[PDB]
Design an enzyme around this catalytic site. Structure first.
Site, PDB file in Angstrom:
ATOM      1  N   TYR A 164      56.901  14.389  57.908  1.00  0.00           N
ATOM      2  CA  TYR A 164      57.245  15.316  58.933  1.00  0.00           C
ATOM      3  C   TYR A 164      57.215  14.763  60.318  1.00  0.00           C
ATOM      4  O   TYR A 164      57.990  15.210  61.188  1.00  0.00           O
ATOM      5  CB  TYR A 164      56.284  16.512  58.907  1.00  0.00           C
ATOM      6  CG  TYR A 164      56.513  17.396  57.721  1.00  0.00           C
ATOM      7  CD1 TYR A 164      57.821  17.800  57.450  1.00  0.00           C
ATOM      8  CD2 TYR A 164      55.474  17.858  56.902  1.00  0.00           C
ATOM      9  CE1 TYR A 164      58.126  18.632  56.374  1.00  0.00           C
ATOM     10  CE2 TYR A 164      55.763  18.680  55.804  1.00  0.00           C
ATOM     11  CZ  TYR A 164      57.087  19.056  55.542  1.00  0.00           C
ATOM     12  OH  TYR A 164      57.403  19.866  54.480  1.00  0.00           O
ATOM     13  N   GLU A 174      49.981  27.340  50.185  1.00  0.00           N
ATOM     14  CA  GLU A 174      51.017  26.428  49.713  1.00  0.00           C
ATOM     15  C   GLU A 174      52.198  27.054  49.010  1.00  0.00           C
ATOM     16  O   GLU A 174      53.228  26.440  48.728  1.00  0.00           O
ATOM     17  CB  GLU A 174      50.353  25.387  48.748  1.00  0.00           C
ATOM     18  CG  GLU A 174      49.745  24.172  49.496  1.00  0.00           C
ATOM     19  CD  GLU A 174      49.145  23.193  48.565  1.00  0.00           C
ATOM     20  OE1 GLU A 174      48.053  23.664  48.045  1.00  0.00           O
ATOM     21  OE2 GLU A 174      49.611  22.099  48.309  1.00  0.00           O
TER      22      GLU A 174
END
Ligand SMILES: [Fe+3]
Ligand SMILES: [Fe+3]
Lengths: 288, 288
Positions: B113, B169
């Site tokens: 990321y 998640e």
């Protein structure tokens, strides 16, 4: 707690855990070198090896079997320490990466060894004996116990424990690795040796990392304290290799073994920034 | 402490940490599936992507930028929890392997990321803003704060926290992943989407594992408690996706988004062994 406020690696302060502003390039690059050496137990063909195990002298088998079990248990210890201490204590991100990768790798080493053992010892009876080396094998107690003290030593410093784990991974394994490379020279057990090359290389890197962490420490143990921890471990390694599980067993000279341990110790001392202790040369042509 | 003596996963008792006598085959095989999906940020060619970033509408960039930052920070949270709680609490070896592999993987996601962000936002000024989303981006606070409560919630059970992290998640990321797969459908940003496929697949597996741990729990939360934690998270996800960072921005229908979140929640509920909550169909043809 001490003066952790003063330690960059420990000061309970990244206020981070956002990974890209990279502060410590030396640490990072070690993680990267780790990440890049990834491998799985599966990548090791243990398929010929049963024959070899066969064509081996008994003495050679006792030796090996015992070493595999000694490594099986030690990896366990290493990981626990990382898990419950090192990776908790250290606050710097780059270091967290390296330690998290190291743990994954210990687990894979643990599996490789298990496999070796299972592949060589068909007798589940034995199997067990070996899996439970810490409680069975006296030849692995001292070492195991020495290493366990450090996990439970709750009065001592990170600087002290880092040095100790570097002695465990670098000294406690040195002789054994060396003995395995000896077998390779002699053309025996490819699967055992091939894996050994991988593992040993991982451990080396795990030792270098520890020396690096040591370097990032402000308040480290006095040079005498370090010599003594190293020295203690050297002694213990020598004893295991010549008394408890003598290298004679695979046709090695116990005296040269003893000296390689020392050579190994001095190299570590230098990596930690101190003078050598024993001042011996490396006796193994092949370990060069 | 409660009745941990009764929990197989928690009873502070492997008296183990010798890895090969494999007790839990279902857990093991999950680790193996993890181990086998390994990949490095390096394997993702971000080389064309700057052009794309270019040919994009602003709205599309604001969106994406914000999502990347939201994921950057969340991964951080996930890992911390694993590191300081899950991996400490759980005693069963097979589970320790999986969690140790998951942490290594979170770190790699964190790096991917970071790279995306660095590759798209040349202005270091911005860069920072985004790295510090938890303290800057209100659009990421609630979520971050919701998840952080669980790490610090020291009165609650593992059963409760496991469910919560599965919501983080699996629910907190659902919309975002979905939005990214939307872009792919539209042929945009290959590097962002290719990586997204990897990450999303890892997270899925991390969710399935949590449901499995839940299954190995004896004393779990009442079905009402679970519904409420899930429900709370659903709501929060919906709000972020339609209010805080509306999917309109990349040409998506906020209403169908809201419904996919719910579809996502019900799937998780079933995996945990309960009835569905919302009973909605999956609205996204492509997410099938
Ligand atoms: Fe190691
Ligand atoms: Fe994750």
């Amino acid at each position: 707690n001490p003066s952790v406020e003063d330690e960059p690696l420990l000061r309970e302060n990244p206020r981070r855990f956002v990974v890209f502003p990279i502060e410590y390039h030396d640490i990072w690059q070690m993680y990267k070198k780790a990440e890049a050496s990834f491998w799985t137990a599966e990548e090791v063909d243990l398929s010929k090896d049963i024959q070899h195990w066969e064509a081996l002298k008994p003495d050679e088998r006792h030796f090996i079997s015992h070493v595999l079990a000694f490594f099986a248990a030690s990896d366990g210890i290493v990981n626990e320490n990382l898990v419950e201490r090192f990776s908790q204590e250290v606050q710097v991100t780059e270091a967290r990466c390296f330690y998290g990768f190291q743990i994954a790798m210990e687990n894979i080493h643990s599996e490789m060894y298990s496999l070796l053992i299972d592949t060589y010892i068909k007798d589940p009876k034995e199997r067990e004996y070996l899996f439970n080396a810490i409680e069975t094998m006296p030849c692995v107690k001292k070492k195991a116990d020495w290493a366990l003290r450090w996990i439970g030593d709750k009065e001592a410093t990170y600087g002290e424990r880092v040095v100790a784990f570097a002695a465990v991974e670098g000294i406690f394994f040195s002789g054994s690795f060396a003995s395995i490379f000896w077998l390779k020279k002699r053309g025996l057990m490819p699967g055992l040796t091939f894996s050994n090359e991988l593992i040993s290389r991982d451990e080396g890197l795990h030792c270098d990392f520890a020396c690096l962490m040591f370097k990032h420490l402000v308040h480290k143990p006095a040079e005498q304290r370090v010599r003594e921890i190293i020295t203690n471990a050297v002694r213990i390694e020598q004893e295991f290799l010549t008394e408890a599980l003598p290298v004679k067993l695979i046709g090695m000279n116990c005296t040269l073994m003893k000296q390689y341990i020392e050579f190994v110790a001095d190299r570590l001392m230098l990596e930690l920034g101190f003078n050598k202790i024993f001042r011996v040369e490396n006796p193994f042509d092949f370990m060069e």
